[model samples]
Target: SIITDVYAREILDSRGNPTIEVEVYTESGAFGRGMVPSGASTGEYEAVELRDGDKARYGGKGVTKAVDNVNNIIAEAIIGYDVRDQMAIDKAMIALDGTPNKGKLGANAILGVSIAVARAAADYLEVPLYHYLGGFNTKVLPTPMMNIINGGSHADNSIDFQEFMIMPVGAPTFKEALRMGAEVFHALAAILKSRGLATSVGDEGGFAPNLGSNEEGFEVIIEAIEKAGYVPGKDVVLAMDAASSEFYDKEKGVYVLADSGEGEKTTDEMIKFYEELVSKYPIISIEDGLDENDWDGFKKLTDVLGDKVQLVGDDLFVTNTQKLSEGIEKGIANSILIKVNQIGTLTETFEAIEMAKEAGYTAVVSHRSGETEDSTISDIAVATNAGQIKTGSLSRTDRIAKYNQLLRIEDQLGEVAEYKGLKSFYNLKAA
Candidate 1:
């Protein structure tokens, strides 16, 4: 028999601000494991905060407390249940709690618990979770991964601000993989902390401390990559996240281009900046460098850097199929960023993926700044066959939950996934 237990913790950022709600689970009898879902700002389209105070009020506690409350409720029900019987457990949960509260269970919280239970049950029964789940394919692909760089304002002081990043698939060893990931995060954090640029959430002054010069930020990442024993040009590739591109000015600050004396030169200047970065760095992915409507900027950048790097449309594409199609027609970007709530429906999100594939572009499912622990994105990444996934920071429970889910998926798959580029699987061509 697999034993089950659940617990919750409140994690504060560097400033002691409550930034994340973490929940842990353990299966007692079989395999014992724990999971936590980190909470952050969800960059959803509707502007409706999923875990906002209003919902918490309805749940009889604020969002944070509600999360804790729900964990207890679910934990009580599954404490003695068989981990192998996930379907049965899920059914019982829904029946007892009703379906409307499924998302509030919370998705990450409950899934984390469920995953632990499954692992324990698998260990006790001497069967892998994937085999139990009916997945015949046991080889796990080195999933394309990314992290947040200096892009947004945060509680830490730093010279450079980066928010999102893209990691290459395939770490030579598990330790190496963890080390590489840890280094990337630590380096970025150190840069921010050193410059006194990090600040608590919502503590804004001027352009948010987390928003720094892109050129300098990019340089920092390049240096970090080298220090981490990765060759920028060969061993590993670099990706950039311009979360604050909307606030970028080519003329007044860093990476400025000479004035061409043309109207609306912002886009052109952006193109020039991206072109220079592409030439300088072995950058494989670039997210949101231009404004959403700056198609001309996107086009020029893609035209110049398309062959060298993947121009990913996050703010520009926003997971809307129509916008994606327009960008595809204009050849504005080579990749699309998929965030389910960006378009407000799973079906629409998948449609965007299909459309991007049809247009010869790659799809990368992503997590918003505000995120929960739900690992649904993991399933989406696999189901949609996305070439890449961008969830930031392996430290946070929210982000780690997703990574852990991927690890489990890989464990089930049993073999390493061949990762050539963003289009590796999309083309379906034999390697």
Candidate 2:
């Protein structure tokens, strides 16, 4: 499979924001298209997602320069190269960039080419995308963590946390999981409406109500779950993405809550808040519960809560293997959050997940706050056997596309497709 041509263009994501789109062509006229996603609240240690930085265009979010890099530097290096071996092709692109964090080539630039070539090769192989990515023996549908309430940076709400999600932890099948989530989503909407709250959806289609506190948010979701005819602990569960890094005050040594100011809340105070939530609700996981640089605080949170729900690291890990290696030795958290754009390329992104899994840490494949209709992450979850996925709410098309892709994958695999049930949940003890 010789690469013949490469094309790049500027495209709009779900937020009407500019992003890079790449097309890789092979000798058989097979072409692969890949689009990269953006995040509003990004981590400091993650690979650089390049932007044109032109204030005149799209509030400086334009990716025209990133698109150009793919067409010129990336194309000149990868074109006419063999695409059969994914490593060989991926390495060529990596070596061309010659940067520790892919800053020179731009993560968006490199990821666009990496995924586009992958799609082209899969097409040439005549197998489904997941089959090409995972192999024949790897067949498992992931449990989804659906974000139903949007807050923090993703919405205009007064809530401190970012996403309040629902997990159909007991759903037997992929389609059934989706159905349960949809029911709970509608139920949540009605519950909010009855409370005289706004029902408008945020970026990921989760409600952006001006709630009073995080505790109130929990009460609302639990009521919604019960109203949907589901038992909180047995049938459905809740998960939160606090994205605490957004409001973590380093100087004050506190996890600030109010959008205005709250200098009195310390790290210990916030950890106690989470402990109370776990004691009351059927919460299964908490993501970015601490600041990215707060390793000591993370270790403390893991010590108390790691025995029950998954303590996930999104900003803390950022899909980097070295950081994950450090975390593995430290025994920090029980799970990792996989965002492809965080690392910028598929091979490295997959490597980070493998590193976490090898150390007994559960990996949850996730979507960025901003996304597109691309369903490749859906296959990535199945291919990697991640066991769980976190594409946002059951409402938006961008979020639902990944779930629909999983349903199709389940239908195609039939008996081979084993859906993730209890396997998706984390244990109380670490190895």
Candidate 3:
């Protein structure tokens, strides 16, 4: 139940400005996960998952304060409960503290506690947390998938923020998914065309006929996946990731950057974009579209899109239980993105996952742009039964690390990794 280590690193932005990333480890032991590339931001981040049996850890605004909170919570809560019962422990904590909120508890704070508890529990049980949670029936595939949709401003520094995602194509039986994926691309295309932003094929900024969007390019990809849908076992099953960088706009309702780089689009204009896009596409999962402060907007999108697609929150949720709890109550998003540094502790991350599960929403463990070769998220994805894993392109070694692990798992599990319909397995291998 002791905090063992705290490591910090600097992650550069597209402009190479440094953003601090910190990783905290406990005695429960760390999982092997890989790093993912930054989509439009051009950086990487690290993450860790808390084991179930260790003492609970916590964090807050200040580093020392975060640590103190962890100690206080553990002293009060870890007296007699079975360390292995993480859910029970978390529930007990909530009852004792009366903090029914999610991300407000601080993502880093909870993550630290979760890791301590997990480490202690794993030590007590003499098994990996994944094994304790579930047997090794889950298969890992090597074709690691990475998401590239930049949700906020474009690289040219425009302020318009729109939801865009690139998913990995796996199993062949996923054609239905692929068709739905194409529908999203087509819908995006329609949006761009209506906005007068559309570009013809072969045009510099034209959306790939298959992948939509003249600006946030995914056209070649769309075309490829759509084509793959026609081939048996050759279809690509994609995993979606949304970057919710747009939630910063309040008056504008949505964040739309003018090509002039004046910041964000007007609220009415932003809302127009959101209403139009969500109404058109069959997005499997959306990361962030509204501003972080725009809970109402998030709720609106969720109410509309939750049933049809997986609505996820990354910038908004940050894997903190309080925020997630609020999101759940408000019906914000159907999925939660789990990142370690965002919250700063393992215990909280697990709680976030538990909350998402309890709410019946999909919990997707994610990686940050400023990443290392650490493969912790992969294990979390498998251990927690996350709907999907997002690492990025299969080309870069840092990105490939996660995929390689999955590939090994595919080899071991055999048929368990047998995905049907359109798949990107060949595309991944050919890469």
**Per-model lDDT:** 0.54, 0.84, 0.46
Which candidate comes out best when scored by lDDT?
Answer: 2
Count clashing pairs, candidate 1. Answer: 45
Candidate 1's residue-wise lDDT over 1-431, tens digit each?
Answer: 64455454544332233322333343443553433333323433321112444443433213464346446676687767766666676566545544332454444344445445555655776765444433444332334555544444342323222343536434553334545666765665566667775522231111123433455555666666666666555545667666435455545533322221122335566677567766776666777777666677778877766765677888787676767878888788888887654443344456677788788788887765545555666656755556567766556565676778776665555445433443343432222
Candidate 3 lDDT, tens digit per residue, 312-403? Answer: 67777666677788888877877777765554434455667777778877666766544545455665666655546655443344554555
**Largest TM-score belongs to which candidate?**
2
What's the candidate order when arranged by decreasing TM-score? Answer: 2, 1, 3
The runs of at least 3 residues in candidate 3 whose Cα sits more than 4 Å from the true structure, single-residue gaps closed, are 1-129, 132-145, 149-154, 157-163, 169-216, 226-247, 250-254, 259-272, 278-282, 414-431
What clash count goes with each model? Answer: 45, 0, 95
Q: What is the model-wide C-alpha lDDT for candidate 2? A: 0.84
The runs of at least 3 residues in candidate 1 whose Cα sits more than 4 Å from the true structure, single-residue gaps closed, are: 1-145, 152-166, 169-179, 184-213, 248-265, 416-431
Residue 80, candidate 3: Cα error in Å is: 18
Cα deviation of 333 in candidate 3 (Å)? 1.3
TM-score for each predicted model, relative to the true structure:
0.61, 0.95, 0.57
Estimate, for each residue in 1-431, the C-alpha lDDT of model 2 and write its tens digit: 89998888999999888988999899888889998999432345778878888899998999888888888898988888876677777887788888766777788888889999999999988888888887776687888888887777766666788888888978888888889989998998998899899998777888878777667778888888899999887678889999998888778777778752334467788788889888888888899998988888889998888887798998888887778888878888878998898887788878887888888898889888679989999999899888899998887888989988999999998987887665676444632
